[PDB]
Amino acid sequence: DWVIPPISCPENEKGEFPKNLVQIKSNRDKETKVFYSITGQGADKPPVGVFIIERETGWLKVTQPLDREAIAKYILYSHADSSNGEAVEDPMEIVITVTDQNDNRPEFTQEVFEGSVAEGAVPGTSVMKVSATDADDDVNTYNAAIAYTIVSQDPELPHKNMFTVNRDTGVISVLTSGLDRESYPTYTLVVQAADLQGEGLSTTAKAVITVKD
Amino acid sequence: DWVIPPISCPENEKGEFPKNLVQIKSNRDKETKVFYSITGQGADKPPVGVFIIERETGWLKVTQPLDREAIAKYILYSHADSSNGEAVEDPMEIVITVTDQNDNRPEFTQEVFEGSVAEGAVPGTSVMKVSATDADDDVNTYNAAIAYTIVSQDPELPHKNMFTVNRDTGVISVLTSGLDRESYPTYTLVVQAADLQGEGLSTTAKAVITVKD
Numbered sequence: 466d467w468v469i470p471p472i473s474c475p476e477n478e479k480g481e482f483p484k485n486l487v488q489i490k491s492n493r494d495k496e497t498k499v500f501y502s503i504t505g506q507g508a509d510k511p512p513v514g515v516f517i518i519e520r521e522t523g524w525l526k527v528t529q530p531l532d533r534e535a536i537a538k539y540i541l542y543s544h545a546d547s548s549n550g551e552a553v554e555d556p557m558e559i560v561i562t563v564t565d566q567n568d569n570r571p572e573f574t575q576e577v578f579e580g581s582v583a584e585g586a587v588p589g590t591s592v593m594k595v596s597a598t599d600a601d602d603d604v605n606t607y608n609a610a611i612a613y614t615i616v617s618q619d620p621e622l623p624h625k626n627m628f629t630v631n632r633d634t635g636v637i638s639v640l641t642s643g644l645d646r647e648s649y650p651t652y653t654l655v656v657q658a659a660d661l662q663g664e665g666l667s668t669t670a671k672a673v674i675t676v677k678d
Numbered sequence: 679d680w681v682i683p684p685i686s687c688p689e690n691e692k693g694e695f696p697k698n699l700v701q702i703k704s705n706r707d708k709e710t711k712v713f714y715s716i717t718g719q720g721a722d723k724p725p726v727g728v729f730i731i732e733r734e735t736g737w738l739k740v741t742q743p744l745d746r747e748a749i750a751k752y753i754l755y756s757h758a759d760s761s762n763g764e765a766v767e768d769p770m771e772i773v774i775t776v777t778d779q780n781d782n783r784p785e786f787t788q789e790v791f792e793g794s795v796a797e798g799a800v801p802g803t804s805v806m807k808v809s810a811t812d813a814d815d816d817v818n819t820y821n822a823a824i825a826y827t828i829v830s831q832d833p834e835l836p837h838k839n840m841f842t843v844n845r846d847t848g849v850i851s852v853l854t855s856g857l858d859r860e861s862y863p864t865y866t867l868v869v870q871a872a873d874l875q876g877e878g879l880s881t882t883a884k885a886v887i888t889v890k891d
């Protein structure tokens with residue numbers, strides 16, 4: 466069977482269903498009457514009826530909103546028959562790809578991270594790792610592409626930015642010098658994770674840094 | 679033959695050739711090895727070589743720029759053979775749609791239009807028409823949606839805007855009162871037409887209005 470170039474349908478559609486996607490038909494329909502149908506998971510097997518096809522015209526339709534994060538892709542088969550029951554084409558394998566949107570917010574693996582730095586440590590040294598996940602499509606979009614930032618430091622001393630976060634790795638490093646356990650022994654950072662490479666949906670967690678001797 | 683939904687390729691592509699459009703497989707290639715070719719005008723028929731298919735992968739490719747205004751649609755057929763050159767699928771009908779770019783400036787039907795009006799005529803009274811054409815796709819885009827403007831009036835008396843042009847139709851009308859043949863017996867307007875509804879490519883021409891008793 467040929468495999469159709471994929472038919473895209475974005476997730477979370479609203480309004481009137483069903484909606485037309487694409488017309489799939491046989492160029493033999495002037496030689497004999499052609500009746501169309503589709504089978505497979507999403508047509509006549511679970512989930513039944515998400516897609517339906519017009520029996521005489523071959524208009525493929527979707528009957529409800531989709532969620533890429535539940536099902537990313539459907540495989541079905543179209544069929545062309547004539548009155549006498551002969552198949553007028555081999556089946557075609559129909560591929561339908563659910564096209565992503567940014568409908569998922571990043572999430573930190575924990576609501577509080579804990580680390581230790583040694584007070585005499587060099588601007589460069591690695592303190593700790595923070596971690597988020599996005600459920601969206603990390604292959605075809607930036608909707609799951611996470612920029613880690615530091616939003617705030619407490620206390621703001623000796624300097625405001627004692628610390629640096631690598632925006633891709635979520636690794637927290639020492640930016641700056643004057644780090645003394647006995648002046649200021651614990652810092653509480655508010656860290657942000659935002660998708661769209663930093664520009665999109667965001668969430669915050671806390672990172673608690675204990676200064677050591 | 680199944681006829682696949684059409685594949686869009688914009689005119690006036692730039693850079694590296696060939697470029698990939700779509701992957702056209704058969705799913706009988708787990709079993710033995712399948713070889714692809716294409717025929718049709720645009721492939722093995724004139725214009726020869728605009729599209730090719732990579733024999734082993736089935737990537738359909740475009741080999742040079744297209745121009746919608748010369749050819750807007752191609753029809754190709756793909757074929758699937760085994761090493762002995764025997765068909766393992768019926769052919770598949772491939773439709774290619776060339777999509778529009780705004781690569782055509784509107785042209786006024788004439789370089790100078792002539793019209794005339796009675797000095798008595800009341801504001802709102804209709805004088806003459808100006809007219810432009812645009813060669814871009816006036817069915818699916820705004821690349822031919824022309825808006826009309828008066829750029830200048832000569833002379834600027836008794837007042838600067840004796841006239842008005844409806845931006846959608848090109849009808850020139852009397853805007854303000856005071857027309858009088860024996861003070862100013864003709865006006866020369868520069869008129870402008872622009873696509874994208876005024877926002878796009880532009881051209882100008884002249885309209886000459888003879889004030890009559």
Ligand SMILES: [Ca+2]
Pocket residue numbers: 476531532533534535568
């Ligand atoms: Ca979703």
Ligand SMILES: [Ca+2]
Pocket residue numbers: 567568569570571599600601608609660666
């Ligand atoms: Ca997201």
Ligand SMILES: [Ca+2]
Pocket residue numbers: 533534565566567568569600601602
């Ligand atoms: Ca999503």
Ligand SMILES: [Ca+2]
Pocket residue numbers: 584645646647
């Ligand atoms: Ca100390």
Ligand SMILES: [Ca+2]
Pocket residue numbers: 689745746747748781
């Ligand atoms: Ca063109």
Ligand SMILES: [Ca+2]
Pocket residue numbers: 689746747778779780781782813814815
């Ligand atoms: Ca064009």
Ligand SMILES: [Ca+2]
Pocket residue numbers: 780781782783784812813814821822873879
């Ligand atoms: Ca145009």
Ligand SMILES: [Ca+2]
Pocket residue numbers: 797858859860
């Ligand atoms: Ca007079």
